Amino acid sequence: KERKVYNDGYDDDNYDYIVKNGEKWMDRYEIDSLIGKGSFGQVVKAYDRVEQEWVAIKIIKNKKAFLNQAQIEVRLLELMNKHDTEMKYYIVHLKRHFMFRNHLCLVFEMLSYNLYDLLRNTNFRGVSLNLTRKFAQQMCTALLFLATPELSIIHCDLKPENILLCNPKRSAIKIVDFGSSCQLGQRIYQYIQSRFYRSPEVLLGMPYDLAIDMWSLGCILVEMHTGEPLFSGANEVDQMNKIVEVLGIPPAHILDQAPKARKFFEKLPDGTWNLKKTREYKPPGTRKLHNILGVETGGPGGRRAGESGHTVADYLKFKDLILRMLDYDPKTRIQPYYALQHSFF
Ligand SMILES: CCN1CCN(C(=O)Nc2cc(-c3cn(C4CCOCC4)c4cnccc34)ccn2)CC1
């Protein structure tokens, strides 16, 4: 048993800052309360008294490992907010960044609840399709911003919790984290994406480009509408098997290049790639998207039968776009410039 002291009693046992409600930092920020928690540190509600506006401050952990990755986050956010378009307004704003009590603190604008909270407020019955489209148009517009040849940034951690609403009355969304993010060509890590939204490329261990965020986005949109994660795998092997359930066995010309192909599959004498031997999963390809989305049934789960805009022809556009995002081959996966012009918008 250890009751040591951690950073003069300002830090906890886990490199975080022991947030106390009502603190007045420096002589400017009034820490209201805790907002969110994560591997990076914490997020707090605070009032920037000098500018009389509300801000969300990201208290990075007090460890050189987390403080070095957060500095790459500052550089990317600073680099993104410098470029003059009207798309950088789909990315959360980094107002300023300062060191306080050995924690690197990032001052963000205040956004509202995350897409998962929006999903929980609907008791996981899913948002309407037209609203699912709105998030799709915005995310694809935002994924284009990161694919700017001067940026070339991969988020690597796309998930509902990292897409926040601007106002609690819906529609306007922004991306928020960018801690586990690297620019193309400056890659570093191979265990990058959140399991539910990991691409087959990272699962097989092959080199990845910006196309991995499109895979996550596809899995995000279907989850937003259905209420359940599409590929709700409990571990890496359960993940790849739950992907081949829908999209079938990956192309042989990928597994032949895949370093970690042996982990899930095995090459037969025929040359045909097949799953490893052992029943737990439906035979590859039988869990079709046609039924997950319920195009010709009554929407997902029969809960969208007899509503506006949930046309059978509308779903066929949605189903086509999703399978265009989940193309297993990143060199043929849909790109945001071509995704926005899809017949779904
Ligand atoms: C009316 C009350 N309501 C308003 C405030 N609200 C917010 O969520 N505000 C907020 C959060 C972030 C923000 C959240 N995460 C985490 C991501 C992982 O999941 C946990 C949160 C960030 C990571 N990296 C940078 C910024 C963030 C940024 C701006 N504003 C909740 C409470």
Curated annotation (Swiss-Prot):
Q: What is the effect of changing residue 58 to R?
A: Abolished protein kinase activity
Name the domain of life: Eukaryota
* Active site feature: 157
Phosphothreonine carried by residues: 272
Q: Where is this region: Disordered?
A: 278-308
Protein residues bound to ATP: 35-43, 58, 108-111
> At which residues is Phosphoserine found?
180
- What subcellular locations does the record give? Nucleus; Nucleus speckle
Q: In which tissues is it expressed?
A: Ubiquitous. Highest levels in skeletal muscle, testis, fetal lung and fetal kidney.
Task: List residues, modification Phosphotyrosine.
Answer: 10, 15, 29, 47, 89, 189, 191, 315
Q: Which residues form the Protein kinase domain?
A: 29-345
After translation, the protein is modified as follows: Autophosphorylated on numerous tyrosine residues. Can also autophosphorylate on serine and threonine residues (in vitro).
Question: What quaternary structure, including any partners, is listed in this protein's UniProt entry?
Answer: Interacts with RAD54L2/ARIP4. Interacts with CRY2. Interacts with RANBP9. Interacts with WDR68. Interacts with SIRT1.
Similarity comment text for this entry = Belongs to the protein kinase superfamily. CMGC Ser/Thr protein kinase family. MNB/DYRK subfamily.
Q: What does this protein do?
A: Dual-specificity kinase which possesses both serine/threonine and tyrosine kinase activities. Plays an important role in double-strand breaks (DSBs) repair following DNA damage. Mechanistically, phosphorylates RNF169 and increases its ability to block accumulation of TP53BP1 at the DSB sites thereby promoting homologous recombination repair (HRR).
Could you say which disease the record links this protein to? Intellectual developmental disorder, autosomal dominant 7: A disease characterized by primary microcephaly, severe intellectual disability without speech, anxious autistic behavior, and dysmorphic features, including bitemporal narrowing, deep-set eyes, large simple ears, and a pointed nasal tip. Intellectual disability is characterized by significantly below average general intellectual functioning associated with impairments in adaptive behavior and manifested during the developmental period.
What does the UniProt entry state concerning the protein's domains? The polyhistidine repeats act as targeting signals to nuclear speckles.
**Name of the protein in question:** Dual specificity tyrosine-phosphorylation-regulated kinase 1A
What is the native source organism of this protein? Answer: Homo sapiens
Protein encoded by which gene: DYRK1A
Tell which residues of the whole protein are contained here.
131 to 479 of 763
